[model samples]
Target: KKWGWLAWVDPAYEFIKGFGKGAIKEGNKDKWKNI
Candidate 1:
């Protein structure tokens, strides 16, 4: 059973995956930056 902390349990990585998709769709660099 692969259900532990080291088994596809990366919240940050997963968030970024979806973030990238939205960022691309939005097409706004500043939206993803902290300037």
Candidate 2:
């Protein structure tokens, strides 16, 4: 099984996965600063 925390994931993909599709409507810079 794939454990989420046990693997290397892309930053933007990771962010988008948790943040939802609406989050992608905005810029990565905005989300990067959000967390």
Candidate 3:
């Protein structure tokens, strides 16, 4: 039922990792900031 994996697991850390690695923050991951 989700769109991405890294975002669902750890939005900040995980997202940062992928972001640093060169991945785009695509999709509606704006909610992970509250998690």
Candidate 4:
């Protein structure tokens, strides 16, 4: 059976999608770390 945690991956993708392909290279994660 698949764990429900896999469903959480989309939100991560949704967040990074806002930054496009450069998201991995930048360091702006601190802004969202508190959320």
How many steric overlaps are in each model, in order?
0, 0, 0, 0
lDDT (tens digit, per residue) of candidate 2 on 1-35: 78775556566666668665666556676777796
Model 2 whole-model lDDT (C-alpha atoms): 0.66
Worst 10 residues of 1 by lDDT: 1-10
Candidate 3's TM-score:
0.25
Every candidate's CA RMSD: 6.8, 8.0, 12.0, 8.5
- The window of 10 residues in a row where model 2 has the poorest summed lDDT is 5-14
Model 2 earns a TM-score of: 0.27
lDDT of 3 at 13: 75
- Candidate 1 TM-score versus the reference: 0.31
Please give each candidate's TM-score: 0.31, 0.27, 0.25, 0.25
Best by TM-score: 1
- lDDT on C-alpha atoms for all candidate structures: 0.68, 0.66, 0.57, 0.68
Positional deviation of residue 3's Cα in model 4 after best superposition, in angstroms: 20
Lowest summed lDDT across 10 adjacent residues in model 3 is found at: 20-29
Q: Candidate 4: TM-score?
A: 0.25
Clashing pairs in 3: none
Task: Report residue 17 deviation for candidate 4 (angstroms).
Answer: 0.9
